[PDB]
Symmetry: C4
Subunit: 252 residues, 4 copies
Amino acid sequence: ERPLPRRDFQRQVWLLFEYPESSGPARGIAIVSVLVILISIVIFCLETLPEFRSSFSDPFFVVETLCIIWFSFELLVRFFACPSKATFSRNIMNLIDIVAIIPYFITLGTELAERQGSLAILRVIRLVRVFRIFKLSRHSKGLQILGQTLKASMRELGLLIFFLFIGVILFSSAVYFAEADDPTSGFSSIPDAFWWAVVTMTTVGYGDMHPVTIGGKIVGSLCAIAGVLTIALPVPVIVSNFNYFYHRETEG
Amino acid sequence: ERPLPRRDFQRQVWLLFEYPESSGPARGIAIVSVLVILISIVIFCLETLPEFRSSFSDPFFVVETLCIIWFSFELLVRFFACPSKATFSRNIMNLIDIVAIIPYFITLGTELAERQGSLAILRVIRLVRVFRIFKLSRHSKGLQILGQTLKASMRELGLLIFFLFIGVILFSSAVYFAEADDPTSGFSSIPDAFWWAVVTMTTVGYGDMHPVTIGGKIVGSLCAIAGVLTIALPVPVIVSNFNYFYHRETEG
Amino acid sequence: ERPLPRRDFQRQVWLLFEYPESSGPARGIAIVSVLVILISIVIFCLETLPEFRSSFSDPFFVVETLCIIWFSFELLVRFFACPSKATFSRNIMNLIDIVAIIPYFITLGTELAERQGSLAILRVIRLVRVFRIFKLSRHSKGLQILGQTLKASMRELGLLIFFLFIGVILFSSAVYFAEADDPTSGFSSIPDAFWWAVVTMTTVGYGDMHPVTIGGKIVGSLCAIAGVLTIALPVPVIVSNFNYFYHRETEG
Amino acid sequence: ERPLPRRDFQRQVWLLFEYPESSGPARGIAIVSVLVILISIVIFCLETLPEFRSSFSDPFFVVETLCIIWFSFELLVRFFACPSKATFSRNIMNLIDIVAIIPYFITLGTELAERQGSLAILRVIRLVRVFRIFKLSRHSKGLQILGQTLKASMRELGLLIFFLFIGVILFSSAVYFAEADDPTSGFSSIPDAFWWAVVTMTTVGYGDMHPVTIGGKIVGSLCAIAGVLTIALPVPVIVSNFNYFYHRETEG
Ligand SMILES: [K+]
Ligand SMILES: [K+]
Ligand SMILES: [K+]
Ligand SMILES: [K+]
């Protein structure tokens, strides 16, 4: 299976952290980590309400610091007790941890720089904070199976997007040209109709009464029909791969 | 099969009520019970029209009392003629009966208390009255098969809801951050966009023209595409379980 | 196979009309009949435009009379040349013919009665005229296969409608009760929400922003999810039956 | 396999152009051609923005001329180095090339005619320019597989469109007649409701609250239900054909 450190004071810690099935403290650590991740998600979502829209006051920052403290401590402990370091860098869960710590530390760095004395950079850094949800993949078999299913089916995703792109261009061009005589048309240019074509091929539904002529309606009917085919073509392969990777674990 | 009371004056009644296939009176009782349940459903639905929005007058209460009388009588008869009582408590159809009688009796209790001398409690009790429809599960094989299919596929339902939750958070966050510069945006916070993400992943369709920028439209396209995959993944298992439990009875 | 009249002057006519594959005149008759049916459909649809909204003038009636003349002539010819009359009454295509002639003759009867001297009756008779499209089922194998597929799958259609009815009642009741406190709610009664529940379970999409509270949105999410399951359950059986009846003819 | 010209100065050129796998220059030519096609698509789409809405100035025409130059050169080179000419005319990719050159040359012809001295003709010629996207089918295996899948499944497409046409007529007629008494009805004639029936059978969703009576809503429910069946019937055959043609190449 997986090698052990073969030491007096490392096998115990490695079993405690890596394998939650050995001892009661391991189960406790697992539950604690799950609760901390959920708390961080809730804080990230609630921080942006219009009511609330650098310590002591603004209690929300007292909580993000606690979460980052626990995440960093756990990462360091997992790093020190590990036999191989090349495998440690090669794993995926480890990159994810390094990404969560970063946003907080970079923010503390600019706060200090401005304390001695762009908006796009800060907005991008704030968007990168979402990846703390992917840290749940260490505790659920479903997310790991989904990862394998997606990594084994890249060709089909490529074909799906390629077919969608071809259909979008074809039908947006057709409906722009078949509806340009009237002045009471929302479609002013071909790139304006792109949205209209990606929301009726997938049958989400535009909502507005955008095609108004008769050619517009004939083209819309063809679009609605052809979306079904060019979406249903590459889906069975992905479904079959998921089924295989899902039943293999439990029944094999 | 199923044990009988082995008595002079119980096997007849037990056959009359439990097994509608034995004698003509059993079939008559079955049809009577079906009609009563349908009447109760119609009364429950019609009671809330704005035209009509404690005896003699308000004829609707003359009818609910009749329905409750028949339900209680049938439950008592079924309880007395039954060999095992632990099985009687362990069955499911029996809990359902106990729940239908309750709303009426509790309402009579508060009417008497106020007759000698919250809205939330009464509203909750009124909502609990819906479960009289599940009493049809004693007369249709379809509802029983559906119950078995759902009880044999809890893991897949859990995975469906988990994948939906992850996708909702990811895409609502992305579309809030990619559309916050403009003041002409309906999305004021991440929890505001939650609805928008559960209605385009499932392709029901929002209806409003909510994404207005270009990043909003790119994110919407990705959302519409990815909903299809994360919904289609766990559905074949449930379909296969239903097919098995459905054909097993008729062809086995 | 199928018995012949075994006569000097009937086998020829029966081959000409019943079997379009024998002689060139049979193919000509088939094409003529198809053209007449298409003309009648176009007349029926165009008669109701607002521009046009009992002989000589109103040329449309010159055409319906021609179509009815040909239909009646063909029916009589098919009836006289046929070995068995019990089979003639037992067939389905024959009932369809009798229904198309009727609307025209009844209209001529009331015109004569009023000529010597309700709106609901006339509207119903006008609605019954649609069934001339089903006369195409004599010339397409697809329509016949569809008829067999539907007649072999009545149980599944029943289960589909039963599950839909249960879901509609459950979710309309829930969303009415979870959204009644506010005055800015479109749902005034449970029968008012019925439509809202049949258009999000099937994912057609309401279009209006009808649920406005938070309970309304949670219930809407559950409705959108559960419609998928209770629709996908009984569809594979119908698909399999169609596939069987479709490939049986060509490859068997 | 495929015959070679068997010549001193033709096998080299034929290998360079026809087979991109032989030599590095062949790969370079392939990438150059892909870039040129993408550039032409982008120009065709961007030409129609309202900002921009015969040489030197109007730089966009400097670019279309370059693209047409390369396309024509490549077509001539491919034509001269080819063993069989009947096969050259019989191929499909060749017709596609001839169609792209044409729009530009015809436009130059009318510009010269008017230079010495309808809108519908020019609009049609502008619409025909879309087919430059199909020139990508020489470089992707997905598009070729899609072409084979569509050419092997014409009967099922015919059946799909036939069933859709029958359903559309039936339900549009029913909803027009069941909703004509009221004056507050958007449906003025049967051909007015056609659109409403093709957008709820496919579950795209109309968006407007068009059915207002009770018969309108019952008919709408039946329409939403029946669209699912008459769309799902012929889709598995097409999916199976695509799967066969897709896996045959890689695993056979
Ligand atoms: K759908
Ligand atoms: K849909
Ligand atoms: K909509
Ligand atoms: K929709």
